[PDB]
Every structure is written in structure tokens, then in C-alpha cells.
Amino acid sequence: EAPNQALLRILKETEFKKIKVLGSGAFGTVYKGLWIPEGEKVKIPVAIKELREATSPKANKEILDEAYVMASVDNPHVCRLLGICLTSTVQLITQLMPFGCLLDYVREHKDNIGSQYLLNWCVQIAKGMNYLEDRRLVHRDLAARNVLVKTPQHVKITDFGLAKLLGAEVPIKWMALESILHRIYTHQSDVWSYGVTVWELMTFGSKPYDGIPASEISSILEKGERLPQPPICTIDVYMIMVKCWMIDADSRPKFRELIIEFSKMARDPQRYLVIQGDERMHLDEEDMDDVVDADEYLIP
Ligand SMILES: COc1cc2ncnc(Nc3ccc(F)c(Cl)c3)c2cc1OCCCN1CCOCC1
Numbered sequence: 001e002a003p004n005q006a007l008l009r010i011l012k013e014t015e016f017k018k019i020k021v022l023g024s025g026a027f028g029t030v031y032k033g034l035w036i037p038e039g040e041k042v043k044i045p046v047a048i049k050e051l052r053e054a055t056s057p058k059a060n061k062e063i064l065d066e067a068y069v070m071a072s073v074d075n076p077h078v079c080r081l082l083g084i085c086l087t088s089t090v091q092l093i094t095q096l097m098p099f100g101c102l103l104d105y106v107r108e109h110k111d112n113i114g115s116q117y118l119l120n121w122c123v124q125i126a127k128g129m130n131y132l133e134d135r136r137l138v139h140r141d142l143a144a145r146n147v148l149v150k151t152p153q154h155v156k157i158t159d160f161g162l163a164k165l166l167g168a169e170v171p172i173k174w175m176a177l178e179s180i181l182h183r184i185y186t187h188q189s190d191v192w193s194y195g196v197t198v199w200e201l202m203t204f205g206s207k208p209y210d211g212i213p214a215s216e217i218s219s220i221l222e223k224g225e226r227l228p229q230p231p232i233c234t235i236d237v238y239m240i241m242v243k244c245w246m247i248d249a250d251s252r253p254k255f256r257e258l259i260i261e262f263s264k265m266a267r268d269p270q271r272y273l274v275i276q277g278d279e280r281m282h283l284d285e286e287d288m289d290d291v292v293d294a295d296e297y298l299i300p
Pocket of ligand 1: 022023024025030046047048049066092093094095096097098099100101148158159
């Protein structure tokens, strides 16, 4: 195994000025602010994950594990960790993804989202996940909700609190069968989740096996049932989703194939997704002359 010489950066607290919450509840409190790497004269829009203040030795492990992963990836379609802050509870700082999670985005923008964007998105996650495969990380929690929007043309995967190395040693509806029955997890289990995610976006944000309670899923799937073809979907596309849902995992597409196949489709997107009124579809404060995007903020 290669050594991991990622650098973990430790950020002071005087180094950044929070400016509004975004996501309390569930587990923590994703805020949003601005990071001014002192002695640089740049401000970086950032989000900051200071999970539920309660500093129970439990969750400090879960978050440093996240950070460990995030510090160690580096690729345009995956969210990298900028640094962490060690204040009382551990804050996780990262490039702000201003337009939120891809799920909310589709749900909130149905009547304006084109095939070109839908397909492009799939291209981008397939890339993000292939990068993770190159680095041998099994994501284990791919979902619309864990993909973020930097701009409508630029999504990036996220949430690695469950990420792991292939070989090493709970969201039912996104999980490959062999994961539900025998907690086996591969890049090919990720591909299934990809299929489910793709199905999420084609349905503008539906909920997979809406209704069906989790305990039944394992049976439903063994029976041979899958998610239905969404309306806008050509058979060519539904066929990819379904190929992601084959029992014999080796028979599922590889992410590099998915990058390829959707990429083909994205050149002529109207032939692959039939959307009403496709052709006609189009998708900050005080001092900011110094703002630079994390993606443009690099270090040696
Ligand atoms: C503007 O919306 C976001 C931008 C974001 N930009 C970057 N990162 C986010 N989340 C995130 C995800 C994983 C991480 F490890 C870290 Cl450090 C941050 C972001 C989360 C964001 O929103 C999360 C979904 C908001 N809901 C709103 C209702 O309450 C629950 C959460």
C-alpha cells in the first residue's frame, strides 16, 4: 500500500468568521462563513461542520474519520476538506457549495432542469466515484443527498462518514443486495447506489421504494423487483439504471463505463431524456473584492 501524505491543516478560530447556520438538527449544525487564511488576503466561502456541541468521545472519532478521508481525496468531483479546527468540539471546514445538496436542488427546481444538466450530473458523479475507485475508497453512502452543487453545472460528491478501503472491515434503499444480506461492500456495491441516485435525479427527487418499509426491501429485491422507469426516461437510460441493479455485481457497469456511456448521451441529450419544454430552459454581501473559491485556493 502507498503511504498517505495528505496534509491535514489546522485552522485557528480567529481565522474565520461564521455567518449563519444552514443545517442544524439531525446530528450537528452545518454553518456557513468565510475563511481568511491570515497572511494571505483572500476570503474563502466555506461551510463548517461543528456537529452537535456535546463532545462525546464517540462522535469525535466519527468526524476525524470523515476528515481523514476528505483530506486524502483530491479531484474536481469530490469535496475536499480545507482544514479542521480544534476548539472544544471539532469543526470540519470545507469549500461552501452555495446551491445546497443535489436532492433539494432537483426537488426545488423540477420545472427548469434540462436533460443536458441531468445527464451532465450523472457524468460528474460517475467521475467522482471513479476517482474514489482509483484511490480504492468504497463510499458506502452515495445518494442524491450526498452530492453537492457548486453551481448548477458543477456537482461534487460528499459525506464520507462511511467511506472505507476496499478489502477492509443504515440507508436501505440505496444498498446493493449483497450489502443488505451479507454486509458485503464493493465499488460494485457503490455502482448500485449510483443507479439509485441516478434514479433519484431522473424522477426529480422522488423517494425510492416510497412506501415500502425497510425490512421488506431485501425480499422485494430477491423477488426481482426494481425501481420503475421514470417518465422522462428513454429505455436506453433506464437500462443503465437496471444494469446497475443486477444481482451479479461483476455484471454491473464500472464507473469508467458509466462515465463513458452518459458522456455519449450527454452529446445529444434530447434523444435520451424526454422533458416537456426542454429547449427553453435556463438555470454575496458588503465587501467581497477579495473572495476566491476553494477550487482556486491552492497550497504547496
Ligand atoms: C447551502 O447548503 C449547503 C451548502 C453546503 N456547502 C458545503 N458543504 C455542505 N455540507 C457539508 C457536508 C459534509 C461535510 F463534511 C461538510 Cl464539512 C459540509 C453544505 C451543506 C448545505 O446544506 C445542507 C442541507 C440543509 N438542510 C436544511 C434543513 O436542516 C437540515 C439541513
